[PDB]
Amino acid sequence: QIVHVRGDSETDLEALFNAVTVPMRLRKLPDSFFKPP
Amino acid sequence: QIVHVRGDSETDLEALFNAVMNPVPMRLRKLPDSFFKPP
Amino acid sequence: GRSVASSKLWMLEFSAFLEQQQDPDTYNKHLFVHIGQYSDPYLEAVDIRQIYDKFPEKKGGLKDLFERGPSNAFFLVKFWADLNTNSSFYGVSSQYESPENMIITCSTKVCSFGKQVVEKVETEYARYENGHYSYRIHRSPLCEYMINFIHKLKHLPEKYMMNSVLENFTILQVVTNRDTQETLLCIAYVFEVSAGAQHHIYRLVK
Amino acid sequence: RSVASSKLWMLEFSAFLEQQQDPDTYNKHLFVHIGQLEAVDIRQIYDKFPEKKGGLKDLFERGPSNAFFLVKFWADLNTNGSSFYGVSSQYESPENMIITCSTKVCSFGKQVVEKVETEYARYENGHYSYRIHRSPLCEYMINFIHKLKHLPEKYMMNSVLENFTILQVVTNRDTQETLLCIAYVFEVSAGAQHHIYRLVKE
Ligand SMILES: CCCCCCCCCCCCCC(=O)O
Numbered sequence A: 001q002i003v004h005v006r007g008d009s010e011t012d013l014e015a016l017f018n019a020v021t022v023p024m025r026l027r028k029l030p031d032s033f034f035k036p037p
Numbered sequence B: 001q002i003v004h005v006r007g008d009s010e011t012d013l014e015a016l017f018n019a020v021m022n023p024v025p026m027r028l029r030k031l032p033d034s035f036f037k038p039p
Numbered sequence C: 001g002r003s004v005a006s007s008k009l010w011m012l013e014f015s016a017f018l019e020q021q022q023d024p025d026t027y028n029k030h031l032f033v034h035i036g037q038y039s040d041p042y043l044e045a046v047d048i049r050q051i052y053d054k055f056p057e058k059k060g061g062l063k064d065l066f067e068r069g070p071s072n073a074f075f076l077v078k079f080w081a082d083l084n085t086n087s088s089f090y091g092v093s094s095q096y097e098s099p100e101n102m103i104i105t106c107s108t109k110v111c112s113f114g115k116q117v118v119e120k121v122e123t124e125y126a127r128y129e130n131g132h133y134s135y136r137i138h139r140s141p142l143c144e145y146m147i148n149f150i151h152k153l154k155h156l157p158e159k160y161m162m163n164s165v166l167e168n169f170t171i172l173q174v175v176t177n178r179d180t181q182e183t184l185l186c187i188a189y190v191f192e193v194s195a196g197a198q199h200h201i202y203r204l205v206k
Numbered sequence D: 001r002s003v004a005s006s007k008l009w010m011l012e013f014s015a016f017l018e019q020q021q022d023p024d025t026y027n028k029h030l031f032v033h034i035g036q037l038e039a040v041d042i043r044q045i046y047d048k049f050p051e052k053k054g055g056l057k058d059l060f061e062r063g064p065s066n067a068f069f070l071v072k073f074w075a076d077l078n079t080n081g082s083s084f085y086g087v088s089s090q091y092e093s094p095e096n097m098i099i100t101c102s103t104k105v106c107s108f109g110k111q112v113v114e115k116v117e118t119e120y121a122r123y124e125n126g127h128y129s130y131r132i133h134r135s136p137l138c139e140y141m142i143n144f145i146h147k148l149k150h151l152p153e154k155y156m157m158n159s160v161l162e163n164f165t166i167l168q169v170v171t172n173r174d175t176q177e178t179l180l181c182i183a184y185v186f187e188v189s190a191g192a193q194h195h196i197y198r199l200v201k202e
């Protein structure tokens, strides 16, 4: 198993959370995409 | 997986237990001392 | 059960899990997500242009791969992951089948805001079984980025915050024939947290 | 590299009970486990295995003698939604072969159940890997484990086990060569443990 990790994966992981474009809920996706089975 | 079962497997299984439910052994054979003591 | 299947490769199983060893003879396994082998639901189509901005788009990105084809090898999986969990091993297992004997490469790209942050590359060899060829990725370790991401999501006080964070998180798995570079399967993964684990599978179309 | 002939090495062997609490939660208990050698005179165990044509003595005399092993297990029976009793094993060989694994469950030296599985090779680092994954335990074995656990004392379980053996024979299907022949003997653990022995002619 070869793993390629970007040099800033640590700060990039926190950048996903720091924030909390068209939202997925408003895109042309089937109704099933937002209702779990 | 191909399984060949003997026609009397149910009563055969009960026969293993009959000897203990109604009351040369390995311990007396030429086996190493380690055979009867778990690590 | 042919759902995530092109004309050359079928993914029979895919699961990601946390296994805890209580003692040498006792293990507890929790599944975060699981696709495996009742009634196959019809796979609804999704216009792939609706997801291009969520995956890498440089040379060799999702659009280039899709345009190269074959179009029947592209899928979108929406998962509702089960994060209700407590000597730990985080792993991914998957199984594939093909009528052909090939050397396959499975590349998994973990993406943040549509950009690759981690790439895992695994090479797999065929095993003949019952007239076909089987390929297995058994207990492949979850990378540290994914393990720390699962931990950080679980520390959020509400599931809607986890779903908000997950809006910018995606995974792109590309399985290719190593000797021909043919795309055997390309699966885009999108996530929400389950409010057990559930999924819907879609065919990606132009 | 303990259970290994010149053509096949059994890397792993485990028998287990896996319970599904719900679709995302599984608990697995190992009854026995070999994972990653004193000699025993094979004549000391002939009466505990079938001895008709193709029996243990015939197989041993045909050879090769380096393919024969005796495993003594101390099984862990300390267990318990939907249950699955299974056996998993993994083998390695420098050769690409079709192998047949026959498992004979024996009572008083007589075969009661035989399971036959055919396995093909997967190339791995210049050598070949073979895997029997989650092979189902037969009903005879499942009911035997249940009956064993219901005995009120471990010495009674050991007494019952005196007349219970398992013989596993792994063969190259094309040449009929015996790649591994493993005789299994059991006691109940007072975790699970084992000792591996080489079977020799004297
Ligand atoms: C909702 C976030 C929980 C994560 C669910 C697991 C998703 C499948 C894992 C596939 C990632 C393999 C790549 C890797 O770990 O290196």
Ligand SMILES: CCCCCCCCCCCCCC(=O)O
Residues within 6 Å of the ligand: D015, D031, D032, D075, D087, D103, D105, D113, D115, D136, D137, D138, D139, D141, D145, D166, D186, D187
């Ligand atoms: C003490 C006896 C129970 C210990 C656990 C059983 C280990 C035997 C595994 C091999 C039996 C598989 C053959 C079969 O049932 O078809």
